[PDB]
Amino acid sequence: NPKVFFDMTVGGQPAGRIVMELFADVTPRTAENFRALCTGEKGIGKSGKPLHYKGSSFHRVIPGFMCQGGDFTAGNGTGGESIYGSKFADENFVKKHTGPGILSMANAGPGTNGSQFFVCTAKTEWLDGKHVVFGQVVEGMDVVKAIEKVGSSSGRTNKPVVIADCGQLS
């Protein structure tokens, strides 16, 4: 399984590296999409912007629930773009939301996977079968905690949370 990373800033301050293992052996299509968006491999998408998480933000953070990001298109939670040229199907729901660090796809209903993702800060069992789990934070979960700290009940952060750098680790 490939391992990818985010180097994060919170309020402009470096906050650490989040390291994620991608379940390519369980969700090959979903993993590859995420992995590719970490490296920037694919270049420019249909949106005219690089297919790359680098520089994008966590725009929706709810403490005790999850941190959501992945909109490198509009940078406001409405955008995002997969590497397949369109939204892609829910590959499978084998993996469940079993606790903190769970990496899963945000969507707009069935078969609408783009680039928006979320990292759980607890068990989110109610999302089972609706959101494709495809990864797990394996290092730097404490960095996710720092992100969680600036969240709110509305989801608005109170400091900008930015992916300062990102890519593939192994």
Partner: peptide, 11 residues
């Protein structure tokens, strides 16, 4: 509620 959607944020 506690959802994670992309466009229309629900309760």
């Amino acid at each position: 509620x506690l959802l994670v959607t992309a466009g229309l944020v629900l309760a």
